[PDB]
Each structure stands twice: as C-alpha cells, then as structure tokens.
UniProtKB/Swiss-Prot annotation:
Subunit structure: Neuronal AChR is composed of two different types of subunits: alpha and beta. CHRNA4 forms heteropentameric neuronal acetylcholine receptors with CHRNB2 and CHRNB4, as well as CHRNA5 and CHRNB3 as accesory subunits. Found in two major stoichiometric forms, LS (low agonist sensitivity): (CHRNA4)3:(CHRNB2)2 and HS (high agonist sensitivity): (CHRNA4)2:(CHRNB2)3, the two stoichiometric forms differ in their unitary conductance, calcium permeability, ACh sensitivity and potentiation by divalent cation. Cells produce predominantly an (CHRNA4)3:(CHRNB2)2 nAChR.
Span of the entire protein shown here: 240 to 626 of 627
Protein encoded by which gene: CHRNA4
Protein species of origin: Homo sapiens (Human)
Main function: Component of neuronal acetylcholine receptors (nAChRs) that function as pentameric, ligand-gated cation channels with high calcium permeability among other activities. nAChRs are excitatory neurotrasnmitter receptors formed by a collection of nAChR subunits known to mediate synaptic transmission in the nervous system and the neuromuscular junction. Each nAchR subunit confers differential attributes to channel properties, including activation, deactivation and desensitization kinetics, pH sensitivity, cation permeability, and binding to allosteric modulators.
Domain of life: Eukaryota
Coiled-coil features, chain-numbered ranges: none
Lipid-acceptor residues (S-palmitoyl cysteine): C32
Intracellular or extracellular location(s): Synaptic cell membrane; Cell membrane
Listed transmembrane segments: 11-30, 36-52, 67-91, 109-127
Associated disorder: Epilepsy, nocturnal frontal lobe, 1: An autosomal dominant focal epilepsy characterized by nocturnal seizures with hyperkinetic automatisms and poorly organized stereotyped movements.
Family: Belongs to the ligand-gated ion channel (TC 1.A.9) family. Acetylcholine receptor (TC 1.A.9.1) subfamily. Alpha-4/CHRNA4 sub-subfamily.
Protein name: Neuronal acetylcholine receptor subunit alpha-4
C-alpha cells in the first residue's frame, strides 16, 4: 500500500554502488587487506538501508514480509559469491578446458557477471508479461 515501482528504483540504485564497489577492490587491489575493508563497508550500508526499511514499516502483518524475500536473496547471493570468489582465486587445482595462456579476460568477465545477475535477477523477479507465458 506504499511500495510502488519507486521502491525498486531506490533499491536498485545502491544495488549497483555496492556491487561495483566489491569489483573495484578486486580489480586494482592496492593492499592485501583491502579485501576485508570492502567486506566491512558493504555491511555498514546493508545494515544502514535495512533499518530504514524497518522505519517506514512497509508491512505490519504477522508474517510473510515484502522485501524480506529480496533483502534475503541478495544477502544470500553476495554471500556465496565471496566464498567461491575467494576459493577460485585462492587456488586452481582443476580447469574448464584451457591450460596455456591465462589471466587476462577473467577481470572483464568477472565484473560482467556481478552486473549480469543484478539486472537479470531483478527482471526475472518482476515477472514481466513478455516472459510470463507466451
């Protein structure tokens, strides 16, 4: 009763700032400790925007919240991401197929994925008419 399309515009704005942010430090990591620095940064914002939503009270029902499904999906996604991204970069025991000539387009494709889920995920969640059935 007060969460129009705008709610998505205000949630998508930060979704990118926090997304690209993580990729930034991963692109040009000056210090080896910058990793943890970014992790804590996202937490502050995540907890900052979170409380805000609890102030407007978008849903005062018993259970089954509104954004509760979104904030959870993102937190869960970004979570497993930092886990795999850390391992994949921690060591490479196995490979997809290539062996020689590596380490060049992994950076460009890396950030390309984070943004690929941000848009795709958002759209797919909206469940448009063009992708509804026909």
């Amino acid at each position: 009763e007060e969460l129009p399309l705008f709610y998505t515009i205000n949630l998508i704005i930060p979704c990118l700032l926090i997304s690209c942010l993580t990729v930034l430090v991963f692109y040009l990591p000056s210090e080896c400790g910058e990793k943890i620095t970014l992790c804590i940064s996202v937490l502050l914002s995540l907890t900052v925007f979170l409380l805000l939503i609890t102030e407007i009270i978008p849903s005062t029902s018993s259970v089954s919240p509104s954004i509760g499904e979104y904030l959870l999906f993102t937190m869960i996604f970004v979570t497993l991401s930092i886990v795999i991204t850390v391992f994949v970069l921690n060591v490479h025991h196995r490979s997809p197929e290539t062996h020689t000539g590596g380490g060049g387009g992994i950076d460009r494709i890396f950030l390309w994925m984070f943004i690929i889920v941000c848009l795709l995920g958002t759209v797919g969640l909206f469940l448009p008419p063009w992708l509804a059935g026909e």
